[PDB]
Amino acid sequence: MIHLYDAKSFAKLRAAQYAAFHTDAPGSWFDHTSGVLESVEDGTPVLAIGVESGDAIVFDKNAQRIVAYKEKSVKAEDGSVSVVQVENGFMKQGHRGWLVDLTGELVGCSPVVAEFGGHRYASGMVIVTGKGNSGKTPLVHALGEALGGKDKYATVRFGEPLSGYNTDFNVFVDDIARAMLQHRVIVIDSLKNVIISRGAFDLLSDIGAMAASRGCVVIASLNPTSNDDKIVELVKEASRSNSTSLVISTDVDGEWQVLTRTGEGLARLTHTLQTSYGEHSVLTIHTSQTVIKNDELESVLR
Amino acid sequence: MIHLYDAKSFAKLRAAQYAAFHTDAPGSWFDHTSGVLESVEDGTPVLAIGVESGDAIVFDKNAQRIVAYKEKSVKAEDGSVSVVQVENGFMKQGHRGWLVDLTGELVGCSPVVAEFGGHRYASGMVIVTGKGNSGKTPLVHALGEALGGKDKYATVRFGEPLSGYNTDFNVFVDDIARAMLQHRVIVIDSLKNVIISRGAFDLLSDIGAMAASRGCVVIASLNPTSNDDKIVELVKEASRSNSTSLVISTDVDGEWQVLTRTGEGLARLTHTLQTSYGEHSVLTIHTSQTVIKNDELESVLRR
Amino acid sequence: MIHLYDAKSFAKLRAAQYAAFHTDAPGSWFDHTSGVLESVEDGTPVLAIGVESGDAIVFDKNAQRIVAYKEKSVKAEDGSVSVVQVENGFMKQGHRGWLVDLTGELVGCSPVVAEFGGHRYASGMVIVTGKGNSGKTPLVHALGEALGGKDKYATVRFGEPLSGYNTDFNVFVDDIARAMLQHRVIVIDSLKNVIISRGAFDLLSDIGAMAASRGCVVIASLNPSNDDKIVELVKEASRSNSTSLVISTDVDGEWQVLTRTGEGLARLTHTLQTSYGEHSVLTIHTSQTVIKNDELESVLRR
Amino acid sequence: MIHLYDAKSFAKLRAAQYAAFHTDAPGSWFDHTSGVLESVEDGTPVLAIGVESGDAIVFDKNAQRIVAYKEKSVKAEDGSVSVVQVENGFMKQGHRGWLVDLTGELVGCSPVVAEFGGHRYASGMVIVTGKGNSGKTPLVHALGEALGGKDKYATVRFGEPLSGYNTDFNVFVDDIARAMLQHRVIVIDSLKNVIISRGAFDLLSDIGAMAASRGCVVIASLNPTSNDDKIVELVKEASRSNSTSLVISTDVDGEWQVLTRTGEGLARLTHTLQTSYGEHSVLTIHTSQTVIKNDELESVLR
Amino acid sequence: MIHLYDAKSFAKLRAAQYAAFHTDAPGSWFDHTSGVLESVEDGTPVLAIGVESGDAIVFDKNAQRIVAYKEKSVKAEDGSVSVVQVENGFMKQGHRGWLVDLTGELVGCSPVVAEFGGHRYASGMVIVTGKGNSGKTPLVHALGEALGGKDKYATVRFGEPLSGYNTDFNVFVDDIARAMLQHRVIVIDSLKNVIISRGAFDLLSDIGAMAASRGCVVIASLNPTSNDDKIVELVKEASRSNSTSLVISTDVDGEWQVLTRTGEGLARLTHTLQTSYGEHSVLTIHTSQTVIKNDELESVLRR
Amino acid sequence: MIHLYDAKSFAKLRAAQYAAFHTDAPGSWFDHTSGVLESVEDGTPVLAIGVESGDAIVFDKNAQRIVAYKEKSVKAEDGSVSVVQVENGFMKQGHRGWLVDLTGELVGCSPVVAEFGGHRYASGMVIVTGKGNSGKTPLVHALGEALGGKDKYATVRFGEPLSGYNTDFNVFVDDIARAMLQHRVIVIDSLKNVIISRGAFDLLSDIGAMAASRGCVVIASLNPSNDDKIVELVKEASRSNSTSLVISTDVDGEWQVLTRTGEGLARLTHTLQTSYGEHSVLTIHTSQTVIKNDELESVLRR
Ligand SMILES: Nc1ncnc2c1ncn2[C@@H]1O[C@H](COP(=O)(O)CP(=O)(O)OP(=O)(O)O)[C@@H](O)[C@H]1O
Ligand SMILES: Nc1ncnc2c1ncn2[C@@H]1O[C@H](COP(=O)(O)CP(=O)(O)OP(=O)(O)O)[C@@H](O)[C@H]1O
Ligand SMILES: Nc1ncnc2c1ncn2[C@@H]1O[C@H](COP(=O)(O)CP(=O)(O)OP(=O)(O)O)[C@@H](O)[C@H]1O
Ligand SMILES: Nc1ncnc2c1ncn2[C@@H]1O[C@H](COP(=O)(O)CP(=O)(O)OP(=O)(O)O)[C@@H](O)[C@H]1O
Ligand SMILES: Nc1ncnc2c1ncn2[C@@H]1O[C@H](COP(=O)(O)CP(=O)(O)OP(=O)(O)O)[C@@H](O)[C@H]1O
Ligand SMILES: Nc1ncnc2c1ncn2[C@@H]1O[C@H](COP(=O)(O)CP(=O)(O)OP(=O)(O)O)[C@@H](O)[C@H]1O
């Protein structure tokens, strides 16, 4: 819905947005939204996500896909009406994203998902990428472990010529839906095959906001291997604007720069990570706030 | 409809167009068109806007979407007939835009929406853009507040990987329709995701005229930072010709140039704004008439 | 239909074409075709024009749109049959353009629409364009007034972010149809939004011939963007879709008018001076040379 | 159909092909094929041509369009079966082109259509084109007159912003069909608007063979005005390979080079024309065999 | 179907493939496959080829097109099932190409179609092409005559602005189907108009294998004289990989180089031809074994 | 399905992935998955693969295509539901790939398919490619023989102008399905014709994972044309759609083998020598080092 503001209520929102990342307890937003999801009546649609064609499939609070749901209308606070109808497995009426209000008056946040090694990490989508020798798959799994902390992290596998990997996009979004409904920390290997169908475009534009509204983090690897002007700019756009955070490799092997958006038109934060390998190529991130401007960001985006 | 003119009636129109921006009371056009909207019979379609596919959804005066409306014909002054029919939520007959006459004989106006810091601002669409370090989201909200004045301004959120943001285009146009039906000052964050489907193209071409006819201002942020020849020229065209005003960043951080179209084939006006940040990144525009030619405009249009 | 010629009847046509522009009374062709239109039986289709999709809508002599019309066949002089049928608002059978013969044996003309300041102006489409500081919207309205003379000129508004402007292409062609059925002098602001759907392409290719056959003039502004696809389409429309061309020059206020006088005839050029009065109203100052194709192509660069 | 050959019967064909251009009486082939057309039973389809969509409309021997025709099968000499069926104005079964055998065993010819000023001219399509100041519309009409000789030549008008011009492609092909069924010499002004829909592509590939099989000549003007690599190469291909002859302007104003294909894999012939203008821009070709190689042809094709 | 191999049975195949070109009697494969075709039951589909749309039309052993054929299933040796069904003139089930096994265990062959002037020529598709002054149409007819020897060669005409030429693609493939069902030596003039619809793409990819499996040769002219990067690379690909042999003109007028694939991953053979013209432009090839590497091939492929 | 991990269970997986390539008995994974396939109930769908259109055909354990199969739902361990339905030969519900779990908890492996000449070879897809004089078809057959060892290898033929070759894509995928259901070592000649329809794109993205999950190896030849669109698609398929890469070098007869050993594991390189015998039969001469991404990208240029 839309929101009305004056000087006073806008200052309150900016202060609440600041708190969502800087002062709130790591993972609290996730716990809150779980409660919201739990309070929903049984079989009521909570989430819809786009399939390859651009149609959308719909899920309830138990990550069960809904085949049939009679049309129902909900009048929101602003006066706008939300209609939802599902027929033969697909959304007849409604929109893509959260079909129930997870956020209320609190929007444009970057809720804090976890803290690790003296740094706070944002929910939403984190894109792991860059050129050079530093490996992306070992990094996503190490971050997934670290930010999961006490909790296990979920791995969604997609589009690699290795054993057990799904290559069907429609199963991919079904995995992603379920992961976001049930887990705070999610890893995606890999995002290469989506980078084009309507579903693939829908996902790039939908997932960061879906994740941020849930308070979960989706950590996807994206190898920018191609030299093609069409596809390489789509990697830059997804890295710059479709993602909530960006983890990118550097000149020095093992080293990475993390770029975090802290909220709606707020300062973007940067820090550096050191890493090293153990047995069977398991990566560990070494444990032991500065802002970045847009000219620094565009320089890094190469 | 079409309008017939001679030397005498054309001079009258140019003089009335001048008044709409230069002399009329800020926000008066908006108040007028509200009255017009209020006088419409209940459930009668007043506005239609295009969805992703290029179909269109339709609304009444209370920003309520219309599912069913029997075909009805209205004979305008020029002799042209307007037909409107809605079936299963979508427009079967009719056009995109205002389905009732908000403007009458007064066309090509650029109605003054507000005054702030010694400068008058136009209704229609304002595109906020440019390259460099100066931030666009803090600027749209500051302008939204300033031009709202005594009134609150409405925020439509779209296509950012942050909490509570809608990313479905069909909900976006539903938010925009409602905002324009009910508020003088509107902010859009952000216009990146529309910049391509028929709906997205329809919106770029429809919104400025919709806004200007209502006497409300839509203030949209558009980051041009990507470097593809296809998409960058579409940002220039939208900035040059789809927008009623243009707010663009400069070399000096915090500083912006405002370029305003004052009316149908009238002089384009430029002025400069200074800004600074307060607590939690809230931007304030500092408080305390010159024309710009097309070669100056094209020079500025490079970013 | 098709026309058969020998040396003698071809010389007659060239002489009649010469007269249509050079010697006939300004506006006489328009008056003639009005009479033709008036003589048509009531509700009989006279004009069809293409909508966004490439379908076409149809009108009668009173600029009223026709929803239903039973199939009817007309055998022309050459033996060719013209069939017209309208169903549910759209043309089922027939063609785009004038559905009744306005021209007879007299074709490839550039009928003279008006005279002003010692120069004759052609009916058909006039494209107003060029780069630099000289303004196009003030010029189309000044020309519209001047060529209207004793008569008012009709303004069709399209695709500008200003109050009261239509942005729906289907209403645009409905305005244009009506203007051409009822007025000698027509202004279009602006042609930028058509410059792509089938309707938009149909209009660029249809309007000059529609106008020239009626003996009315359509004066459209077209601001010429730096994309190779779109810029060449502006050159083609300026070179070959238009009957006349009005283009700005180095000196502010000054314009060159390039007029096609008929089917494979000499193209004529002259110069205009202009200045502004109050509320930005433009006046054209009151007080025959041919142009070759190498001069034309030189001028066509902007 | 297909044709079987040995050394002896192939030499006979080459000798008969030589005769079709070099020794046969000008216009004889046209007279022959008229007789063939006349001998066909009434209402039997003789010609089908493609409309904008790629569907095709069909005609009988009197250039009357056929709405309905029951499926009929004809067993040719080679054993191949030709099926023709027309329903609701369009071809349900059959092919584009001549639906009856005009040529028999005699194929790959360039039948001589006329003789004028000491030179023989081929039937098929003649494309008139080139850059520079020499005008194309005056030239097509002068050639149309000259090659028509005792007979009038037919003019098909298409896609110019002048009075009486059709701009609907479906009417254009209906005019062309009729012209070819009833006249030896045909002029087309202009071919710019086809140069893209399936019909337009079909026409470029169909018309030369249709014309050559009838023994009529279609003389089309094509202004190569565009500077676009996509469209300019399509003008070169149409000029090189879709046309039977090529008339192209030169450096010297008034002067043209005619390039004629004399038959299936035969020598291409070149000659030069002088021209000048009279009253109301009527062009006269001045009255008072050499082969061209492929490297000379490609040089000229610029 | 698929084929299983070990070292021993693979060596046998390579030796049999060698024989198909090098030692077998010229035209013997064609005679064999005729016998196979003759043994088929009446009206049973033997060949399907793609039309402009990508649908396919089907023929029997007498080159008669089939309108109706009830679904029938055939279990091959490998266990795979071939289903064929024709309805309303078009293939409802089945594939493009030979609908009956012409080849059995002997695959990847390159069967010898004829011998002329001390050189053996392969069945399959021969593309005649190149730039310069040497003419392609006189060459295809001369080769057609020479390789036909005692037998007449069939000419399929397509897409030239000359008398009696078909320009409809659907008739073209009907001519080609019939020619391949009934003749060892076939000429196509010209392949320019296919060089894009699904049928045209299907044909480029289907014809060489169809011809090679029959043991007939299709000799097509392809003028590459146009200069567009999209279309010129498609001429190179068709010349390099869609054709079984390649005949290409050289610097010296009248002279041509023939490049022959002798079999599945075997050595490619090159030789040179001299030619001259007689009466009414009839070309004669003058009468009285070396391998070419891929770098030599790619060098030659530039035109 | 998705998999949950902590530090401990992730280390176990990496150790199991290491074993799948490095320590497990060559071909053991293939033998296991055969057993799995054998245990399936008769006529139950086990594999679906995409046809030219993007629809998919489905097979059972005996490589017999399924025309009809009533909708059936299977609840997996993670809670996700797999639905399969086949109607009129095509998949109505379900996904592309293995329709039964071949891999369980063990995913992202590169199961060892064979050992030959002191080196271990991975299942999945091996792309054989490169520029220069070294021949690809003789190499795929030599590798097919060598890795087959005691077992015969299956050859799928596609898109060459030679006798007995299929050129229909729908038969190609039917051959591939069957080969993978029944054989450990598979050769494909050739992959040029797929390199574009939805099926062709689906296959490039599906085959490596299908093969790796089965524990069979598909060895395809791909000759790399000088078009920027198509050449980058060859690089992407070589870099990321394939499990291993065999590429020719400067020295004739010599090849470099690049092997992915598992999910985000070290890529291994070794060199092969070859020579020809009689009738062009190639023999690979009988008698671990890692490669970095900058070395890989250097090699990827051809
Ligand atoms: N023990 C070890 N020591 C150093 N580097 C290692 C390692 N194990 C794995 N890596 C690194 O991890 C990389 C593999 O991860 P990525 O960079 O994501 C490419 P990928 O995922 O294997 O395939 P892709 O290119 O298709 O995505 C290897 O190239 C290697 O540099
Ligand atoms: N306290 C502060 N001081 C200086 N600049 C600030 C600030 N708070 C916010 N900003 C500026 O606000 C900008 C954020 O808005 P923008 O960059 O214009 C659009 P966005 O929110 O980054 O979406 P995008 O990344 O998809 O473009 C930053 O570039 C930053 O420079
Ligand atoms: N009084 C005045 N003095 C000088 N120039 C004037 C003027 N009034 C108007 N103009 C010129 O006329 C121009 C307006 O017409 P145009 O620019 O050609 C159409 P536009 O308003 O830019 O809409 P567009 O987006 O379709 O181009 C202005 O740029 C201005 O320079
Ligand atoms: N009396 C005369 N003397 C010399 N040249 C003349 C002439 N009358 C006509 N022409 C020539 O004929 C030309 C017109 O024919 P074309 O070259 O075919 C262009 P067009 O047909 O007028 O428009 P197009 O460019 O849309 O096809 C003029 O440009 C002029 O050069
Ligand atoms: N008597 C003769 N002497 C020399 N060359 C001859 C000849 N007769 C014919 N030719 C050659 O045969 C060629 C004609 O065939 P090609 O050019 O290869 C295909 P085409 O018939 O021209 O169709 P295209 O123009 O669509 O390519 C001419 O280029 C010409 O050089
Ligand atoms: N006895 C031999 N000695 C040397 N080289 C041989 C040979 N036998 C075969 N070759 C080489 O192997 C190559 C054949 O395999 P490739 O070229 O890689 C596939 P192709 O036959 O060109 O079909 P393609 O069109 O799919 O590329 C020949 O170019 C040849 O150089």
Author numbering:
A (entry chain A), D (entry chain A): 1 to 195, 207 to 299, 313 to 326
B (entry chain B), E (entry chain B): 1 to 195, 207 to 299, 313 to 327
C (entry chain C), F (entry chain C): 1 to 195, 207 to 235, 237 to 299, 313 to 327
Reproduce text from the manuscript describing this model.
The lipid-enveloped bacteriophages of the Cystoviridae family infect Gram-negative bacteria, mainly plant-pathogenic Pseudomonas species and share similarities with the members of the Reoviridae family, including bluetongue virus and rotavirus. Their genome of ∼14 kb consists of three dsRNA segments small (S), medium (M) and large (L), which are sequentially encapsidated as ssRNA precursors into the icosahedrally symmetric procapsid by the packaging NTPase P4 (15–23). P4 is a protein of ∼35 kDa, which can assemble into a hexameric ring. NTP-binding sites are located on the external perimeter of the ring at the interfaces between adjacent subunits, whereas the nucleic acid binding sites are found in the central channel. P4 proteins are the only known RNA-specific helicases belonging to helicase Superfamily 4 (SF4).
To understand this catalytic mechanism in detail, we performed side-directed mutagenesis of the residues in ɸ12 P4 involved in binding the nucleotide ring and analysed the mutants structurally and biochemically. In ɸ12 P4 (31), as in RepA, the nucleotide base is sandwiched between Y288 from the catalytic subunit and Q278 from the neighbouring subunit. However, the mutation Q278A had only a moderate effect on ATPase activity and virtually no effect on the structure of the bound ATP analogue AMPcPP when compared with the wild-type, primarily increasing the KM as a result of reduced nucleotide affinity. Hence, the stacking interactions primarily determine nucleotide affinity but not specificity.
